[PDB]
Amino acid sequence: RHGELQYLRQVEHILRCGFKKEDRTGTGTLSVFGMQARYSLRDEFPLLTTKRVFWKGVLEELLWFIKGSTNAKELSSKGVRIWDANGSRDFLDSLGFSARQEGDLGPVYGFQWRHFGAEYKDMDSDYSGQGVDQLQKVIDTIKTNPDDRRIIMCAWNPKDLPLMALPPCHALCQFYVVNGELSCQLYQRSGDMGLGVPFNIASYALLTYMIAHITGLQPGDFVHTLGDAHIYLNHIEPLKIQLQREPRPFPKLKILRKVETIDDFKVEDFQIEGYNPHPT
Amino acid sequence: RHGELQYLRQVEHILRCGFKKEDRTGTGTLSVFGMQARYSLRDEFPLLTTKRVFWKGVLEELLWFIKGSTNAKELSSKGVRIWDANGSRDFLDSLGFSARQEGDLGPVYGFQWRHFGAEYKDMDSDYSGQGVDQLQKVIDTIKTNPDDRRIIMCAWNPKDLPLMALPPCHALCQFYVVNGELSCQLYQRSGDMGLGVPFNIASYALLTYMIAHITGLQPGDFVHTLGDAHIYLNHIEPLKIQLQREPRPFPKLKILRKVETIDDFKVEDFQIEGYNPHPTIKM
């Protein structure tokens, strides 16, 4: 009944039934293609508790997407370094982006979310009014037509892929309204169960909370859908131990004032209450 | 157990646990958000048996996507009329597409799959060399880096939605290879369980057979993921009938000759064998 048991059963499923498969560096995983979990957002927030999730990084990363930034340095300056390797001088050069300033990830999530289809130049360019503001369209559609079956934000942009330091793993999400509740489903093409998945779940549940707040709805569910769901071979033992841990009740997420537009959210507007994860 | 039980069980879930939810024309549905099923493609083909599916329409429609057509007349001439309404004069004007000639669906699947990011003009334009050929990119990637986790074809194109007669319900699909077997997952944003979904399952099952044929792999799984999975209220009794039908074993799909490119498949290349469905039900 605790929502985290779905994630733990997913990990066990992969350990038991996954097939060996290599990633881009020729390093091994056990993998299963196609999974789905449902995390309730109703009076709790699914920030996993069997291993600590880096919540500060979740929140700052999302605010960074929302501002449309593609500069890794702009997130790093918040003390969140998770995108710094992908914007490093040597990683960019290895992709043939030698003309790029360091930190310049190319047209990744924030850019596609706010400017889909605009012509990417660099991370300093001013993209005001260019391309499709998918995030605002999502919000305005939820307000005016909550039954709509087309409420989609898609970061996957086949035309821009060669410019990206990484194609998005979070390929698209869809929102859904019924009974005054806003739900969201993510299609995640590639999921590292041990490192990334718990952070991605918290990311999209946060987005859902933020959008429900500004559209006057209550959070419903977050539906997590994976493509390549995998575990690195040198995470199997730490995971088998985490798999013995009983999850603690999920924390609550509180938004500390009335906020009117998605662009107006700041770190201080949020507070996670009663988060008690198991130790390292 | 029989792969079709998954579909029946999704229908049952929706009838029991779905919420009433109105659609575009305010006609009612029972709806659940988020569902997933896995249909084995290993020496069987998931063409539903509890009611007969329009196999001919599956095949022609898919062939029509592959050639990149956006012209509902070009599919109608095969006697498959499922797009004709969406390309009717009346439908097109209702959407404010006055300038557009009849049959011209705008930049829908065919065009996105073969020319994504191209400037659309009309259904008669020559788009050769324009945009991203995602379909060929998928096939070439499968051939050269089967471990790749980015093997995606996306019909959802935010830029082109305003020109489309209908944004795609089949938003994106991903391919996956392990152990010499090709799998496919479809993200389907909206699924009419009674009328649309059995047809949708066979369509993407068939695309996966075809890519597998071209790339020298064997069919693995089709993983069907749904957004708004719904049943129209006037399909509730016909579906209650269907639910009391036992599924008969799934047929096999045969490809009758060596085909080399995805563009070279034709209707005569395919044969469905052992397809013994319960009668039709109208909906």
The full 3-state SS of B179-202, as one line of letters, equals CCEEEEEEEEEEEECCCCHHHHHH
Strand partners, B37: B224
Given a contact cutoff of 8 angstroms between Cβ atoms, the answer to whether A214 and A260 are in contact is yes
Tokens of B32: 């659940």
The structure was resolved experimentally with X-ray
| DSSP-based three-state secondary structure for B61 | helix
Shortest Cα distance, chain A CAs vs residue B22, angstroms = 6
From chain B, pick out residues whose CB is under 8 angstroms from the CB of A22.
147
From chain A, pick out residues whose CB is under 8 angstroms from the CB of B131.
159
**Look-up of token digits 């290895």:** A94
Cβ contact, residue pair A221, B34, below 8 Å: yes
CA distance A148 to A161: 29
Strand partners, A37: A224
Shortest Cα distance, chain B CAs vs residue A189, angstroms = 7
Given a contact cutoff of 8 angstroms between Cβ atoms, the answer to whether B188 and B171 are in contact is yes
Angle at A11 between CA A8 and CA A14, to 5 degrees: 150
Shortest Cα distance, chain A CAs vs residue B219, angstroms = 14
**Look-up of token digits 């209220």:** B233
Residues 6+ apart with CB under 8 A from B106: B70, B97, B100, B120, B160, B163, B164, B165
Under DSSP, the state recorded for B85 is: T
CA distance B72 to B64: 9
Domain A1-280 is found in CATH 3.30.572.10: yes
CB atoms within 10 A of CB B19: 14
CA distances to A25, A220, B54 from B148, in Å: 11, 34, 34
Angle at B198 between CA B195 and CA B199, to 5 degrees: 80
CA dihedral B41, B45, B47, B49 (to 10 degrees): -110
Cβ contact, residue pair A21, B185, below 8 Å: no
Residue of A nearest to B119 (CA): A117
- Sign of the Cα torsion B256, B262, B268, B273 reads positive
Amino acid residing at B17: C
Could you confirm whether A169 is annotated as catalytic?
yes
Given a contact cutoff of 8 angstroms between Cβ atoms, the answer to whether A227 and A170 are in contact is no
CA A259 to chain centroid, in Å, comes to: 22
Residues 6+ apart with CB under 8 A from A244: none
Strands A252-255 and A218-232, how do they pair?
unpaired
The 3-class SS string of A137-159 reads: HHHHHHHHCCCCCCCEEECCCCC
Given a contact cutoff of 8 angstroms between Cβ atoms, the answer to whether B147 and A22 are in contact is yes
**Look-up of token digits 């990744």:** A108
Strands A181-192 and A218-232, how do they pair?
parallel
CA distance A141 to A151: 7
Cβ contact, residue pair A176, B223, below 8 Å: no
**Helix, strand, coil shares, percent, chain A, to 5:** 35, 25, 40
B1-283 fold: Thymidylate Synthase; Chain A (3.30.572)
Q: Any binding-site annotation on A154?
A: no
Closest residue by Cα to residue B173 from B129, B138, B213: B138
CA distances to A11, A14, A31, A193, A280 from A236, in Å: 10, 10, 12, 11, 15
Tokens of A227: 């493509």
Residues 6+ apart with CB under 8 A from A145: none
Under DSSP, the state recorded for B7 is: H
CB atoms within 10 A of CB A101: 14
Q: Which residues of B183-203 are buried (b: 16+ CB within 10 A; e: fewer)?
A: bbbbbbbbbbbbebbbbbbbb
Angle at A130 between CA A124 and CA A134, to 5 degrees: 105
Closest residue by Cα to residue B226 from A112, A178, A225, A121: A225
Residues 6+ apart with CB under 8 A from A47: A53, A55, A58, A198, A202, A205, A250, A251, A253, A272, A275, A277
Interchain contact A208–B (C-beta under 8 A) = no
CA distance A184 to B152: 21
**Look-up of token digits 């069997």:** A50
CA distance A3 to A55: 18
- Counting beta carbons within 10 angstroms of the beta carbon of residue A11, is it exposed (0 to 12), middle (13 to 18) or buried (19 or more)? buried
Tokens of A278: 């198991």
CA distance B147 to A33: 12
CA distance B258 to A87: 46
Cβ contact, residue pair B190, A150, below 8 Å: yes
Contacts 24+ apart (CB under 8 A), B117-125: B117/A158, B117/A159, B117/B157, B117/B159, B120/B160, B120/B163, B123/B69, B123/B70, B123/B71, B124/B71
CA distances to A105, B109, B177 from B152, in Å: 21, 14, 13
Rg value, chain B, Cα:
19
Number of alpha carbons in the 13 Å side-chain half-sphere of residue B228 = 27
Q: Which residues of A235-258 are buried (b: 16+ CB within 10 A; e: fewer)?
A: beeebeebeeeebbebbebeeeee
Q: How many CB pairs under 8 A join A and B?
A: 126
CA distance A188 to A185: 9
Given a contact cutoff of 8 angstroms between Cβ atoms, the answer to whether A205 and A45 are in contact is yes
Strands A252-255 and B270-273, how do they pair?
unpaired
**Residue of A154, A169, A173, A184 marked active site:** A169
Interchain contact A117–B (C-beta under 8 A) = yes
Closest residue by Cα to residue B23 from B230, B218, B173, B164: B230
Q: Any binding-site annotation on A214?
A: no
Domain spans of chain B, in order of start: 1-283
Cβ contact, residue pair B149, A179, below 8 Å: no
Query: In this complex, which of B33, B147, B159 lies closest to A183 when CB atoms are compared?
Result: B33
Closest residue by Cα to residue B11 from B282, B226, B278: B226
CB atoms within 10 A of CB A175: 27
Query: In this complex, which of B152, B161, B223 lies closest to A189 when CB atoms are compared?
Result: B152
- Alpha helices, DSSP H, located in chain B: 4-17, 55-66, 72-76, 89-94, 109-115, 134-144, 197-215, 236-242
Interchain contact B223–A (C-beta under 8 A) = yes
Query: In this complex, which of B19, B23, B132 lies closest to A178 when CB atoms are compared?
Result: B19
Shortest Cα distance, chain A CAs vs residue B73, angstroms = 26
**Look-up of token digits 């990334």:** A196
